[PDB]
Structure formats: C-alpha cells, structure tokens
Design a protein around this ligand. Structure first.
Ligand SMILES: C[C@@H]1O[C@@H](Oc2c(-c3ccc(O)c(O)c3)oc3cc(O)cc(O)c3c2=O)[C@H](O)[C@H](O)[C@H]1O
Ligand SMILES: C[C@@H]1O[C@@H](Oc2c(-c3ccc(O)c(O)c3)oc3cc(O)cc(O)c3c2=O)[C@H](O)[C@H](O)[C@H]1O
Ligand SMILES: C[C@@H]1O[C@@H](Oc2c(-c3ccc(O)c(O)c3)oc3cc(O)cc(O)c3c2=O)[C@H](O)[C@H](O)[C@H]1O
Ligand SMILES: C[C@@H]1O[C@@H](Oc2c(-c3ccc(O)c(O)c3)oc3cc(O)cc(O)c3c2=O)[C@H](O)[C@H](O)[C@H]1O
Ligand SMILES: C[C@@H]1O[C@@H](Oc2c(-c3ccc(O)c(O)c3)oc3cc(O)cc(O)c3c2=O)[C@H](O)[C@H](O)[C@H]1O
Ligand SMILES: C[C@@H]1O[C@@H](Oc2c(-c3ccc(O)c(O)c3)oc3cc(O)cc(O)c3c2=O)[C@H](O)[C@H](O)[C@H]1O
Ligand SMILES: C[C@@H]1O[C@@H](Oc2c(-c3ccc(O)c(O)c3)oc3cc(O)cc(O)c3c2=O)[C@H](O)[C@H](O)[C@H]1O
Ligand SMILES: C[C@@H]1O[C@@H](Oc2c(-c3ccc(O)c(O)c3)oc3cc(O)cc(O)c3c2=O)[C@H](O)[C@H](O)[C@H]1O
Lengths: 211, 210, 211, 211, 211, 204
C-alpha cells in the first residue's frame, strides 16, 4: 500500500528516485537495504530485482526497478502534482525526444564516468583502499569532454532539455552532489554555465532533502 | 523526410533501421565511413558531438542515440505499421514495464552482448586472437541475463507483455551477430528464449537489415 | 600519547599495528587520515611516509611506516610488557629465523591472495560492482595451497612459529577477520587445525578490539 | 582463369596485393570474403589458406596466399609490364638483398606496430571501446625509432631500397593510409624526408585506387 | 675481407645463417656478440643493425641483418656451390612462390610459437625463472595445428616446397633442434611424415655442425 | 656446514649468495633444476613446501625465503666479515629504520624491478615497460631524497637494505631502464658503489 522505495540513502541511483518523489511532494516509505551486509544480493531483495541493484520500488501493486524507469513512471503517473519533471508541453513529441536524448546522454556518457570517479575518490576511501590515480585522470578527461558539450548546450538554454528543469537535469544530481566533495569539483566550477546549472539544481529543496 | 546517418553493419544503426521498416516509413540511409574515422570528423560531429552512429533527422528535428530515436519513431508514427508501444499506450504502468525492459537491455544485455561479438567476430577481422577468458566471463554474465529472460517469457509471449515492443526490438541486432558465434548455444539451450529469438529474427523488418 | 598511529580503522595494515599495540596494553592515539580529502598524499603525512600509504607511526621522535616493520619494533621495544609477540627465548637466533620464515610467507603467499579475495567479495559487492567469479576461483585455489601448508604445520605445533602466539600469527588476523564474512570462510573451516587456530587468534581480546 | 584475389577491400594485407596488381596494370577479379561472417574461417576459403587469413590468390592454376609472397610473385612474373617493383637491375643480387632487408624490416618492425596503432585509434572506436593511451604512447615510441632509421635511409636515397620505388615501399602503403587519418600522422610529418616519401607513395594512382 | 656473421652460437636466428653457410661449404668468421652484456644494444653493433638484434652479417662491403634476408642472399649469391637452397629450377617463378609461401608460414605461424615453447621450457631456466604450464599448453595447441598442415603437405612432397630440401625447410631447423630436447618432441614424433622430415633435416651435416 | 639450494641466475638465490660472500663464509651451492621442475617435486618440496628457490641449511637449521635467510646470516655471523646490520646493532630504533627500507625493497621496488627485468632482457634477447618505469621512477625519487641525507638507505653504512636490491639492479643495468638510475645523481653513486663490491661481482 502506497509508495515504497527499497534502497539505501547513500546510493546514487536510490537518491535519483528520492529526489523525484520529493519534487512531486509524494508521501513514501524508504525501506532500508543493508548493502554492507550484502542484503541486495540475497532473498528477498532479489525477488524485487534479480540483478541485485538498489533501488527497487512499489506503487500499490506495481513493482519496479531501474532508477530511470522509476523516475519516469513518477513523472507521468503524478504529472500534475508538484514540480513538472516533463517538458512544459508534455504532449509535444519532438520536445519529449529532446529530453530523451539528454537522458540517454546522462546514462551513457555521464553516469559511468561520474560513478567511477565517485568510487575511486570517495567509496574506496571509506574502506581504507587507495585511489587509482590513473583511472581518475583517464575518467576526468572523459568527464571534461561531456561537460564541454553541456557548456555549449547551456549557452542556448537554461537547462539541458530546454527552458525548464526536467528529468534530464534531475538524473545528474546525486552523482554531482558526491563529486562536489572531491577534487573533480574543478571540472564543474571552471565551466561558467555548467557551474550556474550545478548551483541551481543542487540548491533545490528536493536535492537538499537527500543530501 | 527522414534520414539516418550511420553504417549498415552498426548495431545501433540497425536498431533505428528496424524500427523504421516496422513502421513502413520511407527514409534515406546516409553512409558514415567508420573505417575512415568519418564519425570523429566534421560534419558528422555537428550531428552528434560524441561521435557515435547513428544520428537522425525527421524534417527539422535532429536526433542521436538509437533508443531515443526508436522511441520517437514509436510515438510520432504510433498509428501506422507495427505498434512498437504497448497495446494500450496510454496505460502508464504498462509503459513503465516496457521501460524496465529497455533499461535492462541497455545496462545488462547490450554491454555483455557487444563484448562477446567483439571478441568472437570483430577481433577475427583484423589480426587478433579471441581472449577465451573474457568469452567465458561474459557468457556467464549473459547466461544470468538470459535466465531472467527465460523466467519472464514463461509468463508472457514477449518481454514487456503479450505483444512485440521496443523492448524486444532493441535486442535484435546484437542477437543477429551472436547467432553466428558459439554463444548461440546460450539462446538455444533455453527453450522460451530460443522461441523468442526465432520469432523476432524472422520478422521481415529484422531480415531487411541483416 | 607517546605513540601515534596514522591510519584508517578499516585498513588491514593499520589493524595489524593496532592489534600489536593492544596486545602490549600500550596507550596510543589513532589519528584518522582522511583518505577522501587526499590527506595521505599531502604534507605532513608524506613526511611520515613518502609513498603516501597507511599506516604511519610515531613513538616519540622515532617515525616509521610499513605495518610489519612497526609490529616488530613494538615487539622488541616493549618486549617485556603484555603479551610476548616474539618467541619465548627471543635471543635464540634460529628460533627468530623460523618466525621470520612465517612472516615472509604471510607477506608473499597469504596477504596478496587474501586481499584480492576481500576486494572481489566485500569491497566491490557493497558498491554496484560485480564480483569476478574467475578471480575468486583462481585466488581460492591459491589460498587452499597455502592453507594446506598451514594445516601440516599446525599438526606439529600449536601456532605457526612454534608453541606460542607470535607476530607470524598476528599478521594474519585482520585479513582473516574480513574473509570470515565471505564464502571463503569454508577454506578455513574445512581444515581442522587451521579452523582451531583461526578460532583462537580471532577470539583474542586484542583482535576483537579492532573488529 | 585469369587473376583472382580472395579478400576484403578494407584489409591491409589485401590492399598490398591490389596495389601491386594496379601498378602492373593487370586485370583481375576481387572476390569478396565476408570477414564479419567468419567466411575466412570456413570452407571453402580454408582450402585456399589453411590459416584463415585474407588474402588468397590465384593466377590460372597457381594458388597462393601471404600478401608478400603474392606481391613478389607479381613483381617477377609480370616484371616487364607497368611499374617495375623490383630494383632497376633486377639481376643484381646484392641490390636484391638490400630490398629484402627493407621487406623484412617492414614485416617485423613496422607492420605489427602500425597495426596496433590503427587498431587502438581507429578500429576500437568503431565498436564501443576506448583507446588505451598507454599502448598508443608505447607503440608510437617504437614507430618513431623505425621512422628515425627510415629518415636516415631516405637522406641517402630517394626510396627505401635505393633510387626507385620498389616492393619495400609498396608494402607500407596500406597501413600508412590508415595512420594518416589518426594523430599518429605527426610522426610522419615531423620527419621531412619520411614526410616527402609518404606524400609520394600515397599520391600514386595505384595507391589512390584502393583508398 | 670475406664473410663475417655477428651473433651468438646459441641464438636461433644466428644458427639459421650458420646452417646456410655450412650448406654452401663457405668459409666465414663467427664474431661473438655478448648478449648477456647488452653488446647488441651498444655501438658498434648498432651500426650493423639499428634494431639491436643478432645476427648481423658482412660479405665484403655488403652489410646485412635479418636472418632470412641473409639466408636468401647466400642462396642466390652462392647459388652454384654446395647444396642448392633454392628450388631445382630456380628460374621458375611459380616454384619460387611456393617456396615463398612456406618461408612466410615458417616466419608467421611456426617461429613465434616454437620460440615461445623453447623460451618457457629451456631458456627460462638460464635466468632462474619457472615454466608457465598454461603458456606451454596454449602454444602446443597452436603448434599442433601448424604441424597438421605440414603433415598434409608432406604426404604430397618429400619436403615443404617440393621434392628437394630448400630454405623453407632450413629455416625451421634451429628451433626444432631445441624443441627435440623438450616434451614438445611428442608433437613431431606423433605425426609420421613430420617425424621423418625432422629426422632427415636434423641429421644433415650442416645442421649437426651448429648443434 | 652451509648449503644453498637454488639456481645461480635467480634474483632471490643471489641475495643469499651475496650475504654469504660478504661474511666470507664457505658454503655449497646445490643446483635446483628449474627447467626440469625440480623445485615443484620431492625432495625440494620438503625444504620449501611453496616450491620456490632458494632453500637453505646451516647444520640442522633448515630455512627458506631469501630475506629471512639473509637476516639469519647477518645475526648468526654478525661479528665476521662485513657487518650487514647497523653499526650499533643493539639500537632498536636504528634496526626499525633498516626494517622500513627492507619492507620498501620487498613491496615497492622488487615487484616493479622484477617485471622490468623479465620483460626487457627477454624482448632484447629472444624477440618477445612504460607503466613499470613510471612506478620505478617514483621509488627512485624517494631513494634520491633519502640518499641526500645519508650515504646508504638505512644510514651511514651498507646494510641488508642495500644488499637486497643488488641482484635486480645487476639485471636492470643491462637494459635501457639503466637511465632511471643514471639520471639521479645520488642513486647513481649508490648503484655504482654497491654493484662494484667484491661480493656483488662474485655472483654476477
Ligand atoms: C505525456 C506524453 O509524453 C510523450 O510520450 C512519450 C513518452 C512517454 C509516454 C508515456 C509514458 O508513460 C512514458 O513513460 C513515456 O516517452 C517517450 C520516450 C522517448 O525516448 C521519446 C519520445 O518521443 C517519447 C514520447 O513521446 C508524448 O508527447 C505523448 O503524446 C504524451 O502522452
Ligand atoms: C543543437 C543540437 O545540439 C546537439 O545535440 C544535443 C541535444 C539536442 C539535439 C537536438 C535538438 O533538436 C535539441 O533541441 C537538442 O540535446 C542535448 C541534451 C543533453 O542533455 C545533452 C546533450 O549533449 C545534448 C546534445 O548534444 C547536436 O549538435 C545537435 O545535432 C544539434 O542540433
Ligand atoms: C514479475 C516481475 O519480475 C521482475 O521484473 C521484471 C519485469 C516486470 C514485469 C511485469 C511487472 O508487473 C513488473 O512489475 C516487472 O519485466 C522485465 C522485463 C525485461 O525485459 C527484463 C526484466 O529483467 C524484467 C523484470 O525483471 C521482478 O522480480 C518484479 O519484482 C516481478 O514482479
Ligand atoms: C619441519 C620444517 O617444515 C617446513 O618449514 C616451515 C617452517 C619451519 C622451518 C624449519 C623449522 O625448524 C621449523 O620449526 C619450521 O616454518 C613455517 C612457518 C609458517 O608460518 C609457514 C610455513 O610454511 C613454514 C614452513 O614451511 C619445511 O619443510 C622445512 O624445511 C622443515 O624442516
Ligand atoms: O626470383 C624470385 C626472387 C628472387 C630473385 C633474386 C634474388 O636475389 C632474391 O633474393 C629473390 O624472389 C621471389 C620471392 C618471392 O617471395 C616470390 C617470388 O616469385 C620470387 C622470385 O621469383
Ligand atoms: C646505411 C646502412 O644502414 C643499415 O642497413 C639498412 C640498409 C642497408 C644496408 C646496406 C646497404 O648497402 C644499404 O644501402 C642499405 O637498408 C635498409 C632499408 C630499409 O628499408 C630499412 C632498414 O632498416 C635498412 C637498414 O637498416 C645498417 O646499419 C648498415 O650497416 C648500413 O650500411
Ligand atoms: C595443396 C595446396 O595447399 C595450400 O598451400 C600451401 C602450399 C602450396 C600452394 C600451392 C601450390 O601449388 C603448392 O605446390 C603448394 O605450400 C605450402 C608450403 C609450406 O611450407 C607451408 C604451407 O602451409 C603451404 C601451403 O599451405 C593451399 O591450401 C593451396 O591453395 C593448395 O593448392
Ligand atoms: C641484534 C638484535 O637486533 C635488534 O633486534 C631486532 C630484530 C632481530 C633480533 C634478533 C634476530 O635474530 C633477528 O633476526 C632480528 O629484529 C627487528 C625487526 C624489525 O622489523 C624491527 C626491529 O626493531 C627489530 C629489532 O630491534 C635489537 O637491537 C636487539 O636488542 C638485538 O639483540
């Protein structure tokens, strides 16, 4: 009954879902999955996601996993409450496609790089493992290319899909929150439109709630 | 009209081509010469700054990312040819189920399938020897994905439900390649997966790009 | 305190030092080196270890690094307090050599394998990453060969250097603590003298203090 | 009947043969072998080359494989037509040996390095993959040494075997064509005699026919 | 000043040259290059071969390197003395091409595998290293394929290029001599026509002179 | 008496041999035929169950692990030949400083030096690096800084810390990796001194 998120409050992909829920002012329960104990690779969590990755999700009888499938469900199902996470005219197909390009680009070009950066520089550090400086340099060079594209794009429009905040922007927030606490920060601050964009999306109340 | 900027052997290009054929749409395939690095040069970079085929045009609308393109095609031309969305396309929960499968193809299937094709086909063109360790590690991963698919296909005829959708369509080009390799066994040894592969690969739109 | 340890409490090599200090009932400060902030790759930590790795160590004016150099120093400098970590007759050179063989074997044969097993099964799994089952199988086969040697050895003597607990046994403890929380546990439990040895050394109060 | 080449028009080794045929103004059929479908590792291609490598070749009843055995056959069999691919005085044994050194050097020192560089910088990109910048730097250093030797050699003579274009030069052309579309280009252009040599051999009509 | 070979008497490539010289009954000096002291990577040897590999070679004013360029030069320059190392009718271009296929095959398919097998099983011991049994198994499987092709070939003809002993056969001898002192021997003796071929070419006086 | 069970080319065997020569000790080198897998068979396995050269004997005492052996030699025969311990061997802090260097040689230097030697000697000789040279440079920069303060790695005298590096260095001096040593002036002098020692030249 109601909306439940099965995840961990430090997980990037879990935070994606949490931010979208807060943006919609939805009530929900966060059910804690203990990653340190391998609970995500055990039953019963495996029956909610056989790939053993947080988050999983429930809205009544509907059971989901994959953060970006979940956010998009939220954005459609609860379109008319709270922040609109779709384009202003959500019935405009070409505008939806432009948002979709940006979502694909986050998923394929931004996230794997940002993830590796956060893993090397933050998560390894929590367990006393040493950061591989070569992976960091290689991954920062990649991220700089992605951010150069974003810079050009943000010269044209206030946000990545157009003039309003959407899922394209939202999906970047958790990884960015973590990378702002690392030397990777410079890559965002040295690009002026990227920097303003980061400042706006991270100061949103929904973003600050999960931080 | 509709133009696709890509290469006819490319997995991601074939994704778009199959969707266009399924909609019976006319279009032009404008060849991008990957062997000459044309995808990492202007003017192709001005269509996709990440230098990856395919890019796409429908009148004034310019796109890239194969799965954004296919979805656009499926919505813009919803009412002609094959329906690539769910039967009731206005049902939001049903759309979310399709979306899970599309995410799963992208994150769990495609990177593994793409490594298996690289090691067993593409390395052989060129001078290179297939790393049998990568092949074994990747086949074990693929088996886990296909076990999930098997369970799912016991419940429903296709991956998103009772009808062929983008979730199935996105898998076709990688599968077409892997059927020419010993990885074939992973599909054939799983009966519902095997039937599913036979159905989706024998579709006329699939055969047109082969 | 006189004695300071510069490390991280989850680090295997740091725990080696901590256990030795506790065994000697020494007072000391653990100074937590902030790996996430790159503190280990900055002055003043680099003046304690130019290779930028944890732990480093101080006893008055004496500055050290390398966990096994530190534990040995502790064992000699504070020989006649708390547990004896050297051989019963510490002046016996041949007996010291037998302990030294075991310490070398821990360093070369045991530690790199145990480390990789912990990384693949614990560190990676907690994050998003999939445990490479091939590395696990290859490494477990190596570990089994080591533990077979240990089994034969523990049929002759209560501990690895002879009849008493020494640094040879102590140096294995932290890695073992981690591997007991993984399926690699079986390799220890399926060997009866190894199993009794693991049970004894991990139930020591000094071992439990760092867990 | 007549000359047939069994290969693929993008293949470096196939192009070697094609260029030699064009230089002799020979008529021939290119029979396409579908490498993407593994046709080279199946019968009937395996009966033409049991090592499953393109190209294979036929001139009437004579069946050959190995690109450099084929080019040499072409150069002798059809010596007196089109471009002379042997030395001016082809009966001069010491001059032949000098050409033979160069051909060996292309095969052993140039080709494996040039191949790797093309793979890392062009072919990996076609598939997902990322170019390993370390391999590129290691291989470019190797290529630079080769090209330094070539530079010295080209200060004495117009081409690599002497004053005329021969098989020694011809065998380099296909790999060079690919590397001119990569940043490795600089290694050629930064060496003035190498640069002029590359410009000459790539602007030959036979070279341009296969491009 | 006559024929000089600059190399080392244990080197496979040097032995190639020595055998050809002995087959021609030529007088020559072997000038020792001390590999263990890096003499091959220093002047004056580098001025004979800028790639720093034995052997180099001299016949009067003519300076050469690459063992197979040298053997071929010897076979042409001294064609009409001692053993003919070319085909019976050396003016027959198709017959030359058939010998050339076999020479290419020895270089590309046989030599790299045979050379690894000799390194793992014989020469690793010279430097105090242990034989990698996995490399050995992988390489023996490759060598078996090559030898199966050779077996088929030798059903048709007494030697690899036809009815008479040529450079194709000669180039295999040194590697084979070494592999006959290893368990790899079985691959040759398992195959009856290969076995008779090995027995014939290794019992030649010129072969025995370098052993 | 003293016996060493190993192979004369083996880096770890040479470590032991050098220490014996430095102490002017008589001993027998009993060859273990690695090419024939003798190290992975009985009776060698009963001297070292891990099947690695060298093993060692001094009367009834049986040892393996080169660095355990060198240290035993340095203590058992402390007062003869070269002192391989610190000048004041009873000084515990000074021993610890030598111990840091021995650990550093084992963990930071040896694995890198060993890879470089085995890739290049052989690439150069039998026709079969950049990542490893970068790692080695870092280690050698630390050594350079250290050798500005003291004549040797543990202090003012030659000790086991220096000795343990010798065999790998001997091999690397026959490769282009030589430059990493020569481009660092204090490292270069240190290498020249430790490799010209008679005990080092005896095993070369
Ligand atoms: C609000 C909806 O937005 C758009 O539908 C699309 C949707 C979509 C519709 C309903 C859902 O429950 C859902 O999760 C996604 O998805 C798209 C994804 C793409 O990658 C590209 C598209 O053009 C659409 C696409 O056009 C359309 O404008 C549609 O007419 C409208 O009902
Ligand atoms: C102006 C467009 O920018 C670039 O494409 C991107 C688009 C986009 C493409 C086509 C459109 O019609 C549109 O309005 C936006 O959107 C992006 C969104 C992101 O979040 C990130 C991106 O890199 C792009 C991104 O790279 C391409 O150069 C495109 O062909 C060009 O038309
Ligand atoms: C029947 C469902 O199977 C699994 O979810 C999947 C679904 C799915 C299906 C129907 C549902 O009502 C639903 O909530 C989820 O669909 C998939 C599609 C794919 O292409 C691949 C998948 O891995 C799943 C996939 O793993 C999950 O274990 C889910 O919790 C369970 O209810
Ligand atoms: C009885 C002895 O066992 C084995 O050596 C080991 C020794 C050792 C050698 C000589 C002795 O007198 C002694 O009491 C112990 O100690 C070990 C300690 C470990 O932690 C691990 C080991 O593998 C050995 C280890 O393998 C060897 O087979 C040795 O040569 C033999 O004499
Ligand atoms: O004559 C031929 C020669 C040749 C002539 C004079 C020389 O000094 C020499 O070293 C080789 O070489 C060939 C090599 C091949 O690979 C194929 C051939 O047909 C010939 C060919 O027919
Ligand atoms: C000038 C020559 O350079 C080197 O030999 C080569 C020769 C060559 C040897 C003897 C001659 O009389 C001659 O005119 C050229 O030719 C080459 C050609 C290539 O295409 C590549 C090479 O590396 C050499 C190559 O390395 C040798 O160091 C030789 O000592 C010297 O005479
Ligand atoms: C019987 C022949 O075998 C194969 O070619 C080889 C030839 C060869 C080709 C055409 C001829 O007319 C001829 O007399 C010999 O010779 C070889 C010699 C070697 O030392 C190694 C080889 O693999 C072949 C080798 O593979 C090819 O399959 C060829 O097409 C076929 O005609
Ligand atoms: C000669 C001895 O040296 C020093 O003992 C130490 C020894 C040691 C003593 C006797 C032996 O047979 C042996 O093989 C090693 O080892 C150490 C190792 C370290 O890593 C750190 C140390 O401080 C000592 C440490 O201080 C001490 O100065 C001891 O007082 C003295 O008897």
């Amino acid at each position: 009954a109601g909306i439940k998120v099965f995840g961990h409050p430090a997980s990037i992909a879990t935070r994606r879902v949490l931010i979208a829920l807060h943006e919609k002012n939805l009530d929900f329960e966060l059910v804690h999955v203990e990653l340190k104990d391998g609970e995500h690779k055990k039953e019963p969590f495996l029956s909610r996601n056989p790939f053993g990755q947080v988050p999983a999700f429930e809205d009544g009888d509907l059971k989901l996993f994959e953060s970006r499938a979940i956010t998009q469900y939220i954005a459609h199902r609860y379109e008319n409450q709270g922040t609109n996470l779709l384009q202003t005219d959500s019935k405009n197909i070409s505008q939806y496609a432009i948002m979709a390009i940006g979502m694909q680009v986050e998923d394929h070009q931004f996230d794997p790089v940002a993830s590796k950066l956060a893993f090397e520089q933050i998560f390894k550090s929590i367990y006393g493992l040493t950061t591989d400086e070569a992976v960091v340099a290689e991954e920062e060079a990649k991220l700089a290319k992605v951010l150069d594209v974003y810079e050009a794009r943000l010269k044209e429009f206030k946000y990545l899909a157009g003039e309003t905040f959407t899922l394209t922007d939202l999906h970047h927030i958790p990884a960015i929150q973590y990378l702002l606490g690392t030397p990777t920060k410079k890559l965002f601050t040295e690009r002026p439109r990227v920097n303003e964009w980061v400042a706006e999306i991270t100061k949103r109340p929904a973003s600050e709630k999960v931080q």
